[PDB]
Ligand SMILES: O=c1ccn([C@H]2C[C@H](O)[C@@H](COP(=O)(O)O)O2)c(=O)[nH]1
């Protein structure tokens with residue numbers, strides 16, 4: 350089945366992943382260097398052996414495509430995937446005067462009541478960003494996140510480069526170019542960042558009128574991370590193909606440190622006992638072609654029939 | 666045998682590589698996305714089914730390590746791998762007053778006498794760079810080449826970052842870091858360059874006291890390119906391991922566009938009829954550990970017994 354490569358990665362890490370301690374002191378089982386491919390002509394690689402929220406995937410991707418860096422957009426779509434990042438700044442600001450939120454991420458993980466005051470402050474923060482424009486401009490803007498890296502790479506000369514916009518043009522004028530590359534890694538910024546890009550670099554490739562894309566992910570959470578990562582980039586591959594009038598080829602996913610956190614083993618084992626169902630089909634707006642001017646309604650997933658979702662503790 | 670992955674790549678591209686035209690109008694057979702690994706504890710991956718000049722590999726690598734960008738160093742070691750690049754500038758300079766060298770690369774490929782006047786001017790150019798310090802400073806310096814990218818990444822703030830020097834430190838203080846990454850791709854520079862980095866990015870990884878390195882090569886010449894590329898990075902893996910006091914793991918080589926130029930098929934087929942011999946063993950100076958202060962004498966290849974070399978026309 351289409352998603353089999355993912356299940357095969359989960360197995361391999363269980364069988365031969367060496368224990369390797371990580372920064373979160375949680376513990377992991379990892380392997381270095383792995384690659385899997387998905388034939389996008391066979392279907393959309395959104396897992397069926399477990400329910401994945403495609404809505405969070407499409408919204409976040411469009412957010413990236415717009416060159417947006419402000420969370421406000423996301424909250425407007427109920428997408429909270431990045432809140433933790435903006436909320437941190439607020440908490441550590443001189444304007445922040447409320448309950449000490451030190452190590453709130455896992456502190457909430459170890460306190461039902463702390464998580465109460467914490468989920469309270471968070472709910473407030475999200476409200477301000479949603480309504481108070483000046484507050485949003487100050488705390489809702491992540492700054493250095495995929496959107497600016499893809500669409501507004503700051504140059505020494507003081508300008509900004511639209512990597513993605515330029516590459517799409519190159520695909521339209523030199524499809525056989527061996528350097529349709531977009532980077533998210535900037536040695537200048539990487540040192541001072543909290544979490545340097547996990548999706549370090551990706552490359553397009555065209556042949557026989559088909560578009561393929563290879564992604565280099567330096568670090569990966571097999572259980573919680575990967576199911577999403579696959580959907581984000583397979584979707585990007587479709588959008589760019591659509592915009593360039595090409596057929597879709599395959600999404601090649603290359604890994605650096607693929608890992609399983611020790612606290613996801615029972616969950617991963619369970620999923621492995623499930624049998625993949627046919628993959629869903631993706632459908633994009635035929636009339637509209639400028640992918641940068643796309644919105645939710647322009648992308649629809651069909652025939653997605655997953656198994657129930659699988660809950661598991663995030664490693665914080 | 667140790668080099669089997671390479672032979673397996675050659676086969677695969679012959680069997681299922683789709684014809685794909687390239688910028689040199691030569692013609693190629695390519696595949697997108699491939700990965701092979703070499704267990705460095707089993708030997709050094711310098712091909713035995715064909716003779717490869719390790720001297721050119723060690724000198725060029727040290728050149729990179731020194732953060733050097735001036736060809737002068739290379740010529741001092743009889744290494745001419747980069748001449749073509751510096752020679753071009755000279756030819757197109759206002760100080761250059763001699764035979765028109767337009768498209769000299771392949772123009773020489775189609776004229777025994779042009780190649781004569783051309784090899785004459787080149788021999789002169791190399792002499793000036795070797796003796797005339799001022800000329801070298803002007804034409805012998807490539808500027809944006811691996812050495813400066815690895816060891817002196819120019820920042821907007823006006824500084825220069827030593828990626829490699831910093832990463833080696835991180836390996837010594839946080840070996841389990843999932844971001845021991847060095848990039849050679851700069852969106853700001855890539856557009857105006859003649860040949861953007863083929864070796865786009867590489868990543869270190871440590872576990873069980875062993876160092877592994879994964880390389881992302883966006884484009885590759887299976888026949889003339891790869892045999893060298895493998896040696897350069899397997900050697901870098903050894904040097905860094907040596908400097909950090911770790912054992913050696915494996916070199917994982919990831920590819921974007923792996924290709925065979927149409928004019929190398931008879932040669933590749935011939936090599937495929939050869940049977941790999943045991944791999945050579947690498948030996949580094951035990952007393953000296955600061956790899957940036959290394960020189961030829963500090964690295965020796967043992968028991969390398971290849972088959973005769975295989976001549977083939979370079980795609981220019
Ligand atoms: O889309 C994402 C984002 C993050 N990660 C994971 C990788 C690691 O589990 C953690 C980042 O820790 P470091 O790799 O930076 O050390 O987040 C993913 O797999 N997918």
Ligand SMILES: O=c1ccn([C@H]2C[C@H](O)[C@@H](COP(=O)(O)O)O2)c(=O)[nH]1
Nearest residue numbers: 527688860863884885886890891894
């Ligand atoms: O160390 C090297 C340097 C170059 N190439 C090859 C790849 C392509 O054959 C050509 C570069 O052409 P473009 O890929 O940039 O389009 O050089 C290699 O395989 N190895």
